[PDB]
Design a protein around this nucleic acid. Structure first.
Ligand code: SAM
Ligand code: MG
Ligand code: MG
Ligand code: MG
Ligand code: MG
Ligand code: MG
Ligand code: MG
Ligand code: MG
Ligand code: MG
Ligand code: MG
Ligand code: MG
Ligand code: MG
Ligand code: MG
Ligand code: MG
Ligand code: MG
Ligand code: MG
Ligand code: MG
Ligand code: MG
Ligand code: MG
Ligand code: MG
Ligand code: MG
Ligand code: MG
Ligand code: MG
Ligand code: MG
Ligand code: MG
Ligand code: MG
Ligand code: MG
Ligand code: MG
Ligand code: MG
Ligand code: MG
Ligand code: MG
Ligand code: MG
Ligand code: MG
Ligand code: MG
Ligand code: MG
Lengths: 238, 136, 95, 335
RNA sequence: UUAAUUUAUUAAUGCAAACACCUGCAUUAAAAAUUUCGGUUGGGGCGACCUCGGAGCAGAACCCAACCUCCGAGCAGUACAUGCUAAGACUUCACCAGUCAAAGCGAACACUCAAUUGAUCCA
RNA sequence: CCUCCGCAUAAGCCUGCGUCAGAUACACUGAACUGACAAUUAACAGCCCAAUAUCUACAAUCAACCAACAAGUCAUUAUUACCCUCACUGUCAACCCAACACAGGCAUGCUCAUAAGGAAAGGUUAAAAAAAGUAAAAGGAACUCGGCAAAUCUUACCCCGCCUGUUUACCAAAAACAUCACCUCUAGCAUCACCAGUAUUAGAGGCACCGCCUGCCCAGUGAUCACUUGUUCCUUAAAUAGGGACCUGUAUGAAUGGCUCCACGAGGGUUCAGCUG
RNA sequence: GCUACCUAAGAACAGCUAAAAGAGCACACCCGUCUAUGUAGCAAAAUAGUGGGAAGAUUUAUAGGUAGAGGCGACAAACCUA
RNA sequence: GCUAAACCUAGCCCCAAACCCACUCCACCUUACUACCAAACCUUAGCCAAACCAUUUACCCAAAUAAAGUAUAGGCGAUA
């Protein structure tokens, strides 16, 4: 239809961007997803999920200073504004990240496993086995996709030959190249799950529309009856 | 395909959950080499005729045992009147013996405790049951 | 039946009648007995003979069959070796 | 069917037979639902010697021959031969064929069904009655003895008596089935007393029963059908009438056998007790029940018996020897 | 929906083609689609019944007692000319079906039974 | 005497009670009817903008304390380019959507009772029945399906549903739906939904706050460990019954049921006291 | 252009009590519990009284979207121009 | 004697023949009738008939007639 996505920005900025609500509709205009509509207006803060992004005409490990740690409407986790050189960007804040903290981003894989400080982002090869990690990439230089919800931590289980097994928070193992970068520690806003919505009105503010009033028989189907077995059903007590 | 077909049958046809499927694979690896038709039939047998819910099948390691053995034990008990299939409501007049004391136990132990019959009676019953399945 | 065709605007023959009946030119219709091929093992020789017969139809039946066939089927035919040739004309019939 | 008739039989039997038999009921229950063991009764009019040899090749043994040997450690009906397999053998006899003479070699029937016939101590030149002959089996065995001067076959249903004619024709020659030699009737058995009294040396009475074996398996024309529920209720009454009717027809000093296919003591013991009581009051005729302890003892090898019956003998099915239930009570008319 | 007929659609699988996708074929599921829901029995549940033969039952040619009350039948046995043909007739109130039969040819010296049964198409 | 209306803007309509002259759903020979003539004048409002890069973390609430959560309504710079001006359009009315000059529907500002806007009675009489009010001796629910209506303004409960909320526009507002919380199932992932999200997430569902009880088909005895048993192979014609391996990196079970309870309800029932035609 | 839901950018909410709220009383505003009137009516659903809510899962103006084998739905088989 | 009644001709119908239309100026795809700026091709289905319905059930295609409702087709039914 006349739907145009709000996601038009081509240049990264730290300025909050005006975003348009979907209502769970498509470009076509029909609903694809139910229970979405009309919360508090929100502004999008663009997040650089690529922690190892060296500045223009710069290369190698770089350090950044945390300017502030801030609430974000668009995600469960808190975000941090971080400054390095002449660049400011938004990143996902860790559990223990404060203003004034200094964080390092390196692409250096160490022969001897480097000490893993909470704020820093390192390749999985550099990181010791058993370290709590977050903001992992499936492919080298792809960007963080995997552990970015509030209070979520992955575990680097083992490191074989240029490969690393990590445990996603759903207790599912994933194969990742050692060259891929992850952020150490747990994500901010622990005990987010412990929050109490309290009233129906709060979910409406969060933009969640109420569930359908229609009664469904069962979420799962009934087991299909095989050819000889039917007499064994619908036994009546007397 | 062989592995994929097995897990599909359990998830879709047998309506086992992902967690339950994994446990079945962990505990009964013999299901994979087993024919799909036979595996489906075995599940159908426990679910309807024996009136066993999904969690119990997985826990009691039912799919481990051979289909032949299941028939001999259950039909004997059912015909003895000791085992009664659950109704539509699911309630039974006399509680059914547990699969622990049916399949897990030996032939001798089953007859002594559950079946409450001599061995010679059960031996001749095997032959009759074996014949019945031949005509099908 | 089709009294008037969409293509030609003509009366149509019912082809069922042609498959089952013979018209003699004199106006009689000939038919086989029903069930003459059926279950002969359980039937008496007398009954079997009765079944293996070519029998004429009622006036009412003849009138029905006439209406269900066009004039073509009612024409005089001079077939080269016709087994029913002699039966086409009536002899010594009074009213 | 919305609700199977065979299910009603299971429900009915479970509530009554469990209390009747106790721990024995499970054993009986499994046997009833399992496949029936069959005995081959050799046709005497056929080549008895050749068939006996043939069946012996199949490792079948004539139990009645063995029974006669151990009888003398009255006498049973002679000229009866029934081959059955050993205990714990599930072997089936091959289907019977016509013989050289044109009569079938053997008849496949329940071995327990012969016991009422054997209980009746048939003697040559005896006038014998069978009130409920159809479809056959028992009445065929009567003819096999060859001790029947005059045999009367009766059954209420002409449908079932037609089946008997087919059995009689196939097994018994026309010579044996002469005029008044074998009489076949389709009349009511209850009114037999007034028809003819003090006629028969021996009467076999096989009343309609719940047909425990048959009711569990065969759905068609099941007695446990809700349409036939009224028949079941009046069945104990009807059974007494028939047994009484048989007693009237019997000459004083004569013997009758009451055979029932059911486990129920209602249709077994109370019917016998009731018939004696009815006859003693209404007609002032005394009946003495003949003990069959010796008879049960002889046939322990082939058949297991339920040793708790006040009157008569009940054969219970066992999974070892799956012979259909048979309650036979032999009694003599004193007056 | 556990009614019948489908899988055109979607998804997966296998086999071809092609050197993963696409195409053709087949199989399995989901999702639907088209169509129907005979008759008697207060009405409803549990039942019964629908065709053929017999009796109450037309007192005496034929026919005729709905509904009801009862019974039965859905075979079987003996031949193996239970071959062929053909006057005249009967007929379940129509038709379709069904029934009897002289003479003749050929043989020999058109069976018993109350019903014991099924058109057309099609194979 | 009324004013619960008015004045203006927006939206809608489009000359639809101005002048003159005529014929003629109460009527004025006058009408809003017919014909002719006239009129709404921009400052208000509409109608905007050279290009390419680049900039834009810090709400609003008297914005100061204080306190947050649902996280928010308004910012540029550098270089190039640039010199002509007040054009065009709305401006009326007693007005729109409801077939009508319809007790209806209709956004905003100001006036919160008017400085603005209107008239319930065509004339008479004072019957019945009908409608709306006012007053009523003594009694105070005796009425009735029911304290419906009115008067009076009230207690203590029971059932149901936690609650605020939603629903059959036009016969059902509820005990139905939703709902916090809890539980089940499904999913390891980018450039058009979910989502510029990522398992403390998202979707599909169940139940309905909280609070208190309700939880094993994990192999049995005996003294972590031996041993038949369970599962798989082979020998055995093949079996019976013998030879070998494993069950020791972990398991929890209920979209289960009951139980009171605070608050609340135009819910259904009972009740105290008063009160009233 | 009604209505169900959504999107964009807007607007409205007096006074009184309250440690301060999907709080209470209560205007405007939204709705429609109960009764009476009306039943070719003022009205193809209205009027008067009495009621429920009235800072919010609130009410409402403007423009846009979803279309019938469909949409939309806090499921009433609701609403999608009487 | 009121209301009324009465009328004949605008035009139309079927054929035949013949192959029709198309700028005063100005305006008109944006909110049409507003002078003036950075992408089309794609099996019709169904009612209906078959006394239900499920395969099936005439519908122009190159000019009369006749072959002929014939050969054929078809729950070999209806019908084509
Ligand atoms: C259980 S069967 C007899 C079994 C048979 N003798 C056999 O061994 O195969 C009883 C028979 O008696 C018949 N019957 C029932 N009532 C009867 C009566 N009043 N008079 C005569 N026969 C009767 C039944 O129709 C049935 O055929
Ligand atoms: Mg969000
Ligand atoms: Mg629900
Ligand atoms: Mg006739
Ligand atoms: Mg008649
Ligand atoms: Mg002759
Ligand atoms: Mg004018
Ligand atoms: Mg201006
Ligand atoms: Mg004024
Ligand atoms: Mg007035
Ligand atoms: Mg007046
Ligand atoms: Mg009055
Ligand atoms: Mg008063
Ligand atoms: Mg009262
Ligand atoms: Mg009171
Ligand atoms: Mg009263
Ligand atoms: Mg009131
Ligand atoms: Mg008053
Ligand atoms: Mg509520
Ligand atoms: Mg509220
Ligand atoms: Mg409420
Ligand atoms: Mg509403
Ligand atoms: Mg309503
Ligand atoms: Mg209402
Ligand atoms: Mg509810
Ligand atoms: Mg309420
Ligand atoms: Mg919005
Ligand atoms: Mg206020
Ligand atoms: Mg409030
Ligand atoms: Mg309030
Ligand atoms: Mg709604
Ligand atoms: Mg409902
Ligand atoms: Mg409904
Ligand atoms: Mg409409
Ligand atoms: Mg039709």
């Amino acid at each position: 239809a006349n739907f145009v996505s709000w996601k038009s920005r081509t240049k990264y900025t730290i300025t909050p961007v005006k975003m348009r609500k979907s209502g769970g509709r498509d470009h076509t205009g029909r609903i694809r997803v139910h229970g979405i509509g009309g919360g508090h207006k929100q502004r999008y803060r663009m997040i650089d999920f690529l922690r190892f992004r060296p500045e223009e005409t710069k290369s190698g490990p770089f350090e950044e200073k945390v300017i502030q740690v801030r609430y974000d409407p668009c995600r469960s986790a808190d975000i941090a504004l971080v400054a390095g050189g002449s660049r400011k960007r938004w990143i996902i804040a860790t559990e223990n990240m404060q203003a004034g903290d200094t964080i390092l981003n390196s692409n250096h894989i160490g022969r001897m496993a480097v000490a893993a400080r909470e704020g820093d982002a390192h390749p999985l090869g550099a990181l010791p086995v058993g370290t709590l990690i977050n903001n992992v990439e499936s492919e080298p230089g792809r960007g963080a996709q995997y552990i970015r919800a509030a209070g979520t931590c992955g575990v680097l289980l083992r490191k074989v030959n240029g490969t690393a097994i990590i445990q996603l928070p759903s207790k599912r193992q994933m194969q990742v190249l050692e060259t891929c970068v992850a952020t150490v520690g747990r994500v901010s806003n622990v005990d987010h799950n412990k929050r109490v919505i309290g009233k129906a009105g709060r979910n409406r503010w969060l933009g969640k529309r109420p569930n359908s009033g229609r009664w469904h028989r069962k979420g799962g189907w009934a087991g299909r009856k095989i050819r000889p077995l039917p007499p064994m059903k619908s036994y009546v007590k007397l | 395909q062989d592995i994929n077909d097995t897990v599909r049958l359990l998830k879709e046809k047998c309506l086992f959950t992902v967690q339950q499927v994994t446990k079945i694979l962990h505990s009964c690896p013999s299901v994979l080499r087993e024919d799909l038709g036979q595996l489906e039939y075995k599940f159908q047998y426990a679910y309807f005729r024996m009136g066993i819910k999904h969690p119990d099948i997985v826990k009691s390691e039912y799919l481990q045992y051979s289909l032949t053995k299941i028939k001999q034990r259950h039909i004997y008990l059912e015909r003895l009147g000791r085992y009664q299939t659950p109704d539509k409501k699911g309630q039974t007049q006399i509680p059914n013996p547990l699969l622990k004391d049916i399949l897990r136990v030996s032939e001798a132990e089953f007859l002594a405790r559950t079946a409450c019959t001599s061995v010679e009676e059960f031996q001749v019953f095997k032959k009759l049951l074996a014949r019945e399945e031949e005509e099908s | 039946l089709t009294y008037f065709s969409a293509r030609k605007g003509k009366r149509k023959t019912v082809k069922a009648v042609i498959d089952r009946f013979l018209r003699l030119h004199c106006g009689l219709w000939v038919r086989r007995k029903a069930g003459y091929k059926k279950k002969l093992w359980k039937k008496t020789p007398a009954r079997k003979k009765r079944l293996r017969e070519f029998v004429f139809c009622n006036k009412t039946q003849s009138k029905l069959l006439d209406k269900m066939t066009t004039s073509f089927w009612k024409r005089r035919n001079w077939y080269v070796d016709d087994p029913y040739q002699k039966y086409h004309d009536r002899t010594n019939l009074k009213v | 069917p919305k609700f199977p008739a065979v299910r009603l039989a299971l429900q009915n039997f479970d509530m009554t037979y469990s209390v009747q038999f106790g721990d024995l009921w499970p054993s009986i229950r499994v046997s009833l639902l399992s496949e029936q063991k069959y005995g081959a009764l050799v046709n005497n009019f056929a080549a008895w010697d050749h068939v006996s040899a043939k069946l012996e090749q199949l490792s079948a043994k004539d139990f009645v021959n063995e029974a006669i040997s151990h009888w003398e450690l009255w006498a049973c009906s002679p000229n009866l031969r029934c081959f059955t397999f050993d205990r714990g053998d599930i072997s089936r006899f091959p289907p019977a064929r016509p013989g050289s003479l044109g009569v079938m070699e053997y008849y496949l029937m329940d071995a327990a069904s012969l016991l009422p016939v054997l209980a009746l101590g048939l003697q040559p030149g005896d006038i014998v009655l069978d009130l409920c002959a159809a479809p056959g089996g028992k009445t065929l065995a009567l003819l096999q003895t060859g001790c029947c001067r005059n045999l009367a076959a009766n059954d209420l249903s002409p449908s079932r008596i037609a089946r008997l004619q087919k059995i009689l024709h196939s097994y018994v020659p026309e010579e044996i089935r002469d005029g008044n030699q074998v009489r076949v009737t389709s009349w009511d058995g209850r009114k037999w007393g007034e028809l003819e009294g003090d006629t028969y040396d021996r009467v076999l009475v096989d009343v309609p029963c719940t047909t425990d074996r048959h009711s569990l398996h065969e759905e068609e024309n099941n007695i446990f059908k809700r349409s036939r529920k009224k028949e079941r209720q009046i069945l104990p009454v009807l059974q007494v009438q028939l047994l009484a009717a048989g007693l009237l027809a019997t000459k004083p000093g004569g013997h009758v056998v009451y055979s029932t296919c059911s486990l129920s003591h209602l249709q077994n013991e109370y019917v016998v007790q009731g018939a004696i009581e009815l006859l003693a009051n209404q007609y002032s005729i005394q009946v003495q029940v003949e003990d069959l302890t010796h008879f049960r003892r002889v046939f322990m090898d082939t058949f297991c018996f339920f040793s708790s019956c006040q009157v008569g003998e009940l054969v219970i099915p066992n999974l070892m020897a799956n012979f259909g239930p048979m309650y036979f009570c032999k009694m003599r008319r004193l007056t």
